[PDB]
Amino acid sequence: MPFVNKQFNYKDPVNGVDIAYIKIPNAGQMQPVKAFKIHNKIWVIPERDTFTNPEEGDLNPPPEAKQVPVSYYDSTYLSTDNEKDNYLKGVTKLFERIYSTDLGRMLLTSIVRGIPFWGGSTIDTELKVIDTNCINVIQPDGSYRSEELNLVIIGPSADIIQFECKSFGHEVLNLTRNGYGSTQYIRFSPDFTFGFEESLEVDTNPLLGAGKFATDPAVTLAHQLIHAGHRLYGIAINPNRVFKVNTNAYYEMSGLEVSFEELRTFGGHDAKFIDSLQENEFRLYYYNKFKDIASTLNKAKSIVGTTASLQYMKNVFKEKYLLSEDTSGKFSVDKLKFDKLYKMLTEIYTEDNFVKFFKVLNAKTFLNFDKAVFKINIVPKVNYTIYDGFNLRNTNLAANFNGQNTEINNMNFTKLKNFTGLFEFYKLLCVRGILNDLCIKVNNWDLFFSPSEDNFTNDLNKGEEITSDTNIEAAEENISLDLIQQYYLTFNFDNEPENISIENLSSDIIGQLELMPNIERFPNGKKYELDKYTMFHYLRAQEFEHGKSRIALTNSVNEALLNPSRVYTFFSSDYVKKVNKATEAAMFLGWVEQLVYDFTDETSEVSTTDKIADITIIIPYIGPALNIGNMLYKDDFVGALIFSGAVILLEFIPEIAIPVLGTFALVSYIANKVLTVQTIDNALSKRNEKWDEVYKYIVTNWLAKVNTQIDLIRKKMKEALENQAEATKAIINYQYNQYTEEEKNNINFNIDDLSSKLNESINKAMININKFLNQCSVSYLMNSMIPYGVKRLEDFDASLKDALLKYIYDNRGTLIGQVDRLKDKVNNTLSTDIPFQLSKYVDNQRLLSTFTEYIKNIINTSILNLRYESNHLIDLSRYASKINIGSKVNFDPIDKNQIQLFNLESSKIEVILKNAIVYNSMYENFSTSFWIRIPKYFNSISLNNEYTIINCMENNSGWKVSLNYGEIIWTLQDTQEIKQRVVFKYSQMINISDYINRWIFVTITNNRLNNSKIYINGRLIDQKPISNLGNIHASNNIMFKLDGCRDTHRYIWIKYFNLFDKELNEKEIKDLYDNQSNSGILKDFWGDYLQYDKPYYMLNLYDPNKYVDVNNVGIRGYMYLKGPRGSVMTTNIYLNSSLYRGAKFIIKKYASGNKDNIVRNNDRVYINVVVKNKEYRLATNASQAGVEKILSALEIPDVGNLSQVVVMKSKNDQGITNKCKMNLQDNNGNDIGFIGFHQFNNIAKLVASNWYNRQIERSSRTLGCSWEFIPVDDGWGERP
Amino acid sequence: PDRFNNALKHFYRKQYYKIDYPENYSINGFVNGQINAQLSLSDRNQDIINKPEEIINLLNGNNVSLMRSNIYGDGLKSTVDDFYSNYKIPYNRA
Amino acid sequence: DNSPIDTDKKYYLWLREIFRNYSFDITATQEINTNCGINKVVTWFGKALNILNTSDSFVEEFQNLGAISLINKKENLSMPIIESYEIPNDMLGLPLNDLNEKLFNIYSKNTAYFKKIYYNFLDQWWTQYYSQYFDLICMAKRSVLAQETLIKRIIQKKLSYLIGNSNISSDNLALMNLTTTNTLRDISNESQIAMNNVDSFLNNAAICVFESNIYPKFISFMEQCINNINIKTKEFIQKCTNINEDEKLQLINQNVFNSLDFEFLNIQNMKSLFSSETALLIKEETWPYELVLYAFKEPGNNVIGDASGKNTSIEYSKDIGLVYGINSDALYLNGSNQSISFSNDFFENGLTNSFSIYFWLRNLGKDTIKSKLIGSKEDNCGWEIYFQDTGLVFNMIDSNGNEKNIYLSDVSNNSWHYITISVDRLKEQLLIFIDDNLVANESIKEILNIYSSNIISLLSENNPSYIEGLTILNKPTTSQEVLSNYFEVLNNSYIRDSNEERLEYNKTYQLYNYVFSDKPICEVKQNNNIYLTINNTNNLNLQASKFKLLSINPNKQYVQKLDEVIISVLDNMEKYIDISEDNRLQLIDNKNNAKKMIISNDIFISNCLTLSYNGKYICLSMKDENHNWMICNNDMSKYLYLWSFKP
Ligand SMILES: [Ca+2]
Ligand SMILES: [Zn+2]
């Protein structure tokens, strides 16, 4: 199902059909070029485009640099048949990549059926093609054939990375804005891409790579195909509609050119920059254009210049414009059909949405400017594939967008030289004699986007006339993957328009490109005199040039700006003193460790505030880092924020101008009761809209004027943080190079490992900064903007109330008998406020998506996630490590994630780790978690014998998990044989153990700067200092197997093994523990799934020393808790309470809706009781006096109408998690209460008592209605 | 009280409350439980004997008394003397 | 410098700020990184007791010097006197088997001895060290009381003075007096939070001192000890006459001790020390629940009660019925004569307290007319939730006439909804949630004294409804907690219909796909056999097809996660669902051939379900006829696998 069904090679000879030399329309003579028809109506010309526009035909750099941030010029590029063959293949591959997505498949189909309208006729009875919408295909016999086409991809002009849609015009008509459409020529190249900076994804991807990322070229092409799509359907927004910005202020950009069309195309937040009033204006504009095309078709009585029929042709356009055709053949445009189509072309086809489909890193907004240009090659599959792009499945490249990280993936990206110079376009900011002027240049695209107020137009102050008829615009729902799926499944993929025979055009086709408006080059190097250091100065002061000299950090911005060796820091003076000190070689490593710790400490700092509503956390160092607000201590910043709110972050205070809202005027209907009442209802409906309109408007002004300021501040904080890391590294690297060869040789110092560590610290810091800044931006909306809207709205409600009451009373004659009820409707409706809900107007704010990110964050930190799926045990992580399973490994049939490893060489599991994830580092934190079940130790041979179970040691360096008598052990070892062990001890001399032969949850976490920590069942057990350990280099594989165990009958159960690339905190560990406990299925004492038809000995959590017994069988007898349990022992090995003493319960299916013998929460069951090896039925007669119903064991045939049915419940328990409940019910569905016990005389009799059902959940730890089911298990094994 | 509950005299100054049976207290214990029971302060609180274990005299540079504060003993007998030094942890268990 | 307090309004504004500031001061904590972890530190501790108080900050000085820096006697330990190690001279000539199993006995005695030593160290810690942290805890707690007393006296003087001479109305002063009392309670509750803070802070510190200071002295003592033992045991084994050299090496190895034999530290056990019955009882008596409504059916009786463990009294109509709700039995109020009322002194609220109200509600929505559902009101103050239009209105009004009146749109669809309302006086913030969404976030700085009666009344006038899990809390609710409450309760293993009522077997539903939610499944024949599609030709007059779920078990009533199911339809006879070779679902004649499907659901989609066969999930095909067929295929968008049944 491919888009391009031929695989062309550039040297293939011309066939006259899909490979030919062709003439495109041109002003004067044009030299024929070799082109390829890759799909119906779509051609590719692998040539640098000097032909489209003979005016600019020279591939050299212009006299004056273009005012873009990135440009590249190479005249020789694409001059070779080899490069041509590669262009063709790359472009083709990108088409295929796009087509392979649901969204792209629609877009490509839309483009093909988007045939340019036949508007050529000056006589409206006839339908004619427009010439510039065609090409001439030169045949082998020297003749040419004229053929119409929608799309041509051609190589770029002099600026290699400037991609755009070009098309030819008409003497009068505007074909891109009139709905006619015109053949689209896109300048594109698959052989280059842009670099950009991304700090936002660290929330879900804490391991995100450092430095620049590369735009996926498929996104870039898609972007242009979207423009092409608009232009083909004649709905493109006029290029003179532009978003004006304020350039006059020192902090503002010198200028920026961006068009409504581009905003529309980008989608996402960029497109929400265009207000409702104008978005409406356009929809109506093109709707009328469509209506015009309908009337042009309706009056056309014949066709000209083709052998095709007027029927077929009119149908081509009926299918392009979604026209409705009545019984006569007349065409019109259904506002419903049009709305749907215009919506798909402008809200569904958007760069934003393609990113969602490709799953690639991409700039979230055009305001995140391309910082670099890169040479790439996507043709080889080892580089870039149709499905995965650069991020190749089942490899390191699949994780955290590494495929697009230019440093990690460096073989796929070669840095070219940006032709746009250093400070090519800038402003000059000068502080005044704080000694003479200190000036700095600021890059234009480092300045603030400040939209002009004449960008936001509203009719809010225009009144309306409410009418019996006046009717309501719909909700206008937001775009979502499921709405897209709606369009997708209703989309028609069958009918592509044929490639028809058309009358031959002239040998040369005469035409010129549509004129683009001339834009004023914005001013350059404007100078500004300032009294105070700015944000730009504070950031600039954090920079240095490379060199042999030793730099020092300073807390003085002034010093730093004045001296090349002085770099400003916002870290404490303590950090300053420490990083600057000359350090002896013998102390160098410990020095670095301290610096890395201090760095991480200071950048991780978060102050919580309980004082204010919408901002929970504050990052205090933002103040001294950017000079936000003013004064001195960071305690001033925390203080000023708490006091003044988010406004202190803003560079400028935006104007939010909301006028007196236009009041309603109601048309009266004399004597008509029904009309008068409808008018009243309509005025109230339109009132609800007035509220939604005002809210949309403010949200729109906030996205543009405020959220963009905060997004800049954010980008700058990452720049600040990276500068601090570079500075600290440079100082450390200088210190190391001061040493003697001999000193160095005794210090293993890896700058790449240190860099990696600091980059992780910067990520953690950005996570916090990101949250803080989001809350800040939103707080400003809620508190500083929305309220102006709410005041205008309440004044409007007041006016409407007076009007509506006046209307009711004036009409009391018509409205008689209803006057009171209408007053109430009006007074009650209009005395309410409609609350602003941010989640309604923008994508990222839903509550659930906060939890969603948290889950992502833990999943994306998992470098090994080992699960049993389908028929195999595999790695569910994006690295997809290989798993080798020994012949003697056993899998629990009931739950196959439960793995049993015996003591045999064949019983083993080996994970072969991908190289990118094998641990070799001084500084890198990591964690492991897994569940294990360890059989009781029966024999003295197990005493003082430590055996390994999970092995990651390589030449005495790595980690491992080992067991011993009552021990679970974690070992760390560096390459110098320095080791650290941390252990969880558990006794075997115990009445009843939380551990022995029970599923335990183990978590070990490793902080290389601090401590190694072991957790059991979610709780911290022991911690040991590891910071004296040097480089740890672990094994290329992980070996699950019993290594060194002298007990031959020994084995272990294990499940859910994970390896994490961070240090898990307490919260994450508990959440992990809880999530994996499978709370939907009941467990037996051992931790296994509770089962039907399996006999269990019973234990009551309230009195564990007691077991269940039966006084007498029958209705006159009862069951009770007896004791003592007695004990089982082997001297010196174990001493325990016997668990197999008692009567046995068997759970039987009653209501069960399948057969898997697993007992789920809320299963309805019977319980059978085993007494002297015979089966009876647990039952009671609930009619007996008293709320405690005494339970009996009855003959199974004799149960009659007694209460038997039991509802099984699964509860959470601390350090056990085994809590089971049983709620007994009669046959009418009523509750007889949970099963428990009660004292009668000195007997404790099993009882169903509703007193339990009146209690809240966990009350004390001592319940009486909580039970354990103990099956006979090989791991415990006393004599029944 | 769950910690050093035989030493409380040192950690705490007690203030006494009257309990009337059965208005404050009945067979179910305090009426409204141990937290929210409404009990009247005893007029005896002022009769409580105060005899500090030691008195902390806080003077200034001029050696004159600014404040005199009371620390109260636990009531228990003391030493004599150190138990941990002279106690042998038994190796044989009987 | 302000003009004196005259209005009652001015007294309230004053009293409230007095309360908020006291709370901010007294509950202040900062989390710090320590030797043993992160500890939540009481910020004022140094200024209160003059400890590490010579700095400008106690917090950073404590982070610096560590937990041991808070107490006056740092080294109290006494290395215990041991029983020196000698192996009997009578074993020197024993045979292996007997020598072997006799050293095994000595091995155990030793490791037990280690445990004893550790205990001895733990006792010294408690006696010598914890004793000093408990002194700190007590003094710090006394400091809190001393401060609290100062505050109350300040408040009492101001109230006493206004009552003494001011033009404030007699009735006004009366309310002021009642209200202030509630505020003084709110101040104790805040004091209590702070006294818990110093307990955790200082207990953690003491435990850190055991890890950082005592424990390592133990480890020193123990490696000297096992180094000795290791010596004597090696020297002994070499002197063994009756065993050979290969035996000696295997024996020495069996009997050797290393550090792991005595690393007994369990930090969770350290922490569990302080969880006593009393600590637990206190938790349960002081937790935020002021009302937790439970209900269940006894034979011939319906039980309604309150589990909060507070003083709440419940009075209700005798004939109120119970029906299964989301997770439990729900109350049915008929709208006419039925009402229930809950009484707790907390319910009256006041100026300074915070609270949350939540419950599940399903309303059979009819009238638009404003009607009391639930609220607490007296003298026209307090709060009420009303039924209005298609929604609810939350109303809040103080004694000065200031109001919150907030319309919550679209709550009566006759589907269950989870209502959460949060009133936070410390942040002056009102939060209203419907289900998993946050519908209102507002300032309530303008609302002052909401003192109402001690009775909350659930009326539900004119709108028969269902109410479940009604709860009142004395604290505010966050968005994380709401989401957690909402979803946790929602997965009990039950599958739900479009109204979030339990899906039942043998009940007639119509089938809808999540992507076209208003378009029911219909049947259409192609070649002398019949398939399932949806209607994309508006009013093509395809009839909504009628579905019934069947279970292999006659006794099974409600549909649960992972159940095996047979789908049936009533057309002329009863038709059962099968999978074709093209993976397109079709209605057939014979129940025997019917395919047994597994029904399940998404944890985050409450009213929807999923269907699978042999691991292949059920969804809607691409456009065809035009028709979109029900198919068994795994390659479509996730949204297409969500269905719901509407009755
Ligand atoms: Ca410098
Ligand atoms: Zn564009």
UniProtKB/TrEMBL annotation, chain A:
Primary site of residence: host cell
Domain Clostridium neurotoxin receptor-binding C-terminal: 1073-1278
UniProt cross-references to InterPro entries, sorted A to Z: Bot/tetX_LC, Clostridium_toxin_transloc, ConA-like_dom_sf, Kunitz_inhibitor_STI-like_sf, Toxin_rcpt-bd_C, Toxin_rcpt-bd_N, Toxin_trans
Origin: domain of life: Bacteria
Cell location: Host cytoplasm, Host cytosol; Host cytoplasmic vesicle, Host secretory vesicle, Host synaptic vesicle membrane; Host synapse, Host presynaptic cell membrane; Secreted
One GO process term, biological-process aspect: proteolysis
One Pfam family in the UniProt entry: Toxin_R_bind_N
Domain Clostridium neurotoxin receptor binding N-terminal: 871-1064
GO terms for cellular component: extracellular region; host cell cytoplasmic vesicle; host cell cytosol; host cell presynaptic membrane
GO MF terms, alphabetically ordered: metalloendopeptidase activity; protein transmembrane transporter activity; toxin activity; zinc ion binding
Claim: Glycosyltransferase is one of the keywords in the record: no
Record keywords: Coiled coil, Disulfide bond, Host cell membrane, Host cytoplasm, Host cytoplasmic vesicle, Host membrane, Host synapse, Hydrolase, Membrane, Metal-binding, Metalloprotease, Neurotoxin, Protease, Secreted, Toxin, Transmembrane, Transmembrane helix, Virulence, Zinc
Residues that coordinate or bind Zn(2+): 223, 227, 262
Sections of the chain in a coiled coil: 703-730
Clostridium neurotoxin translocation domain span: 534-851
Stretches assigned to the Botulinum/Tetanus toxin catalytic chain domain: 4-410
Cofactor: Zn(2+)
Reaction catalyzed: Limited hydrolysis of proteins of the neuroexocytosis apparatus, synaptobrevins, SNAP25 or syntaxin. No detected action on small molecule substrates
Membrane topology: Multi-pass membrane protein
Similarity field: Belongs to the peptidase M27 family.
Name assigned to this protein: Bontoxilysin-A
Provenance organism: Clostridium botulinum
Gene for this chain: a
